Design a binder for this molecule. Sequence first.
Ligand SMILES: *[C@@H]1O[C@H](CO)[C@@H](O[C@@H]2O[C@H](CO)[C@@H](O)[C@H](O)[C@H]2NC(C)=O)[C@H](O)[C@H]1NC(C)=O
Ligand code: NAG
Length: 121
Amino acid sequence: RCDPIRISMCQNLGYNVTKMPNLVGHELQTDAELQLTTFTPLIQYGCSSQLQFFLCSVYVPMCTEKINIPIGPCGGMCLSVKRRCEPVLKEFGFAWPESLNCSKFPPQNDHNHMCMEGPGD
Ligand SMILES: *[C@@H]1O[C@H](CO)[C@@H](O[C@@H]2O[C@H](CO)[C@@H](O)[C@H](O)[C@H]2NC(C)=O)[C@H](O)[C@H]1NC(C)=O
Ligand SMILES: *[C@@H]1O[C@H](CO)[C@@H](O)[C@H](O)[C@H]1NC(C)=O
């Protein structure tokens, strides 16, 4: 039921299996890996120690046999990462993309919603 993560920048997270489609709409890991390259300057810059985990959690979200939904990031981590990384996008004339809008993620790991919050699987 769950597929291993083929994306190289996503291979050290604490989980290693996923299920497409991801939280951005890709059916294929390979398309997600291509789109991920857009962010490598940001990752290289080091605006947030959580950026890689956050992007991987969105582009290649955690799958488990016990759960029928992709498990993505919590809104809290998204807001934290946005706070640190959006300034870098903006100084270069870009913006925090709509597809990473922090509203589309659950606010906290509830018993009413599941999401990840740190580099914790
Ligand atoms: C981010 O996502 C949120 C949640 O969908 C958006 O909030 C809605 O935005 C639309 C478009 O203007 C409004 O019609 C709704 O009334 C908004 N809902 C709420 C609760 O604010 C938001 O527009 C998106 N963009 C940003 C930058 O936050
Ligand atoms: C995936 O990662 C976990 C983390 O400890 C490891 O125990 C498991 O053997 C790994 N499996 C694969 C297929 O990478």
